[PDB]
Symmetry: C6
Subunit: 89 residues, 6 copies
């Protein structure tokens, strides 16, 4: 299934991206990852069409609240890449 990512500087902007993502399309929220430096990445899974719409809506909503750094979609992540992503853990 497709992979969606919205990366922000600040947790507030992230939470906004998350909410806007799940509300906008039929994607499931995997959760958020923080790599320090105030960087937070929100991750969602679903069909490519859904994930694309969600990520667009997420980044849009996030820019209003804070600083958006990265936005990307992977229609079909390699299986090995799955194991470095959470299921919601």
């Amino acid at each position: 299934e497709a992979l969606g990512m919205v990366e922000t500087k600040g947790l507030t902007a992230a939470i906004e991206a998350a909410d806007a993502m799940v509300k906008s399309a039929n994607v499931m929220l995997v959760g958020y990852e923080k790599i320090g430096s105030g960087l937070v990445t929100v991750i969602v899974r679903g069909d490519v069409g859904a994930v694309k719409a969600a990520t667009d809506a997420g980044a849009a909503a996030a820019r209003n609240v804070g600083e958006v750094k990265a936005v990307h979609v992977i229609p079909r992540p390699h299986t090995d890449v799955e194991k470095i992503l959470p299921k919601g853990i």
Copy 2:
């Protein structure tokens, strides 16, 4: 229930936002999250009217003590978004 967020650079400014928030309106303090880089987000729950007043009072009080980065309100966060927020944990 509504979601309120005040994000500051520095814990001191955050504590001020927190105190001012709960004192100003009938919101419950969920706690604070730190994503590194000195970024701290204070989270509260309550009715939209309460949360809005609290967050306004929080950011105002916080700017006097330190550096306010983000302030946002979500009147009704998606259920999936609930699980990435603490209850007070």
Copy 3:
């Protein structure tokens, strides 16, 4: 009881603030919190008069050793705010 906070960039300046605080007035040292980015906040509890004198003495002593970021006093923190502060833990 009153709440006192001295926030510094660097642990050395913090330790100086701490020592100067407890020596200056009758406040109890709750400990120090670090939110990353080199930010360290020293926390004390006591009567408002004591905490005010301590924090003044703390920030003064700290500026000589390092970089002071924030200094604040809350004469009576809301009860909910208590649970996000340590007792000395």
Copy 4:
């Protein structure tokens, strides 16, 4: 076996590097390491030819998503160096 490394500022750019790496050549994804400051390093193992192609494809794909910091290949890491690398842990 050869060692491949792609280091990015941001987790999103890293995930892109990872996916592009395993899809491009026959390398196994060891995982990613984060040393703070938003720095994330994706690690792969395989034959030198495979690892070289993967890392090229990884950095290329990553620059489109975010900020690439370092890209390196070690055809035969010393055995002692093995123990400071994960197996996928």
Copy 5:
């Protein structure tokens, strides 16, 4: 007993300060603390005369290796301040 502190940006400069401190005077190495942002503080205990000589020698040696941020001596730290310092833990 007296308290000595040498704070550096980088672990290498810190290790140099530590070695130079214990070699220079009769102070016991409590260890080092890191508050993030690359800030590392080396802590020693002993008589004020010893600690003063050690810290001077520490900062001198450290500037040659890296970046020294803070250097301070507390001839007699308050007892409460003791509990926020390690014994070597």
Copy 6:
């Protein structure tokens, strides 16, 4: 025994320093330490002659891959300093 240290900004440059160190002279790799801010220090032990050659080779190799911050050698670290260094832990 002698102590060798190579400090880099980024894990990739560090791994390169490590590999180049053990391959260049007869030093044992203690491991690497990260103090945040992307700072990583590679540590090796051996005879002073070996450690000196290793550290030279390490820093040289590391500058090609990334950013080298500090390079230092301690021919005979004080015993107390031993306990703040890993054995390979």
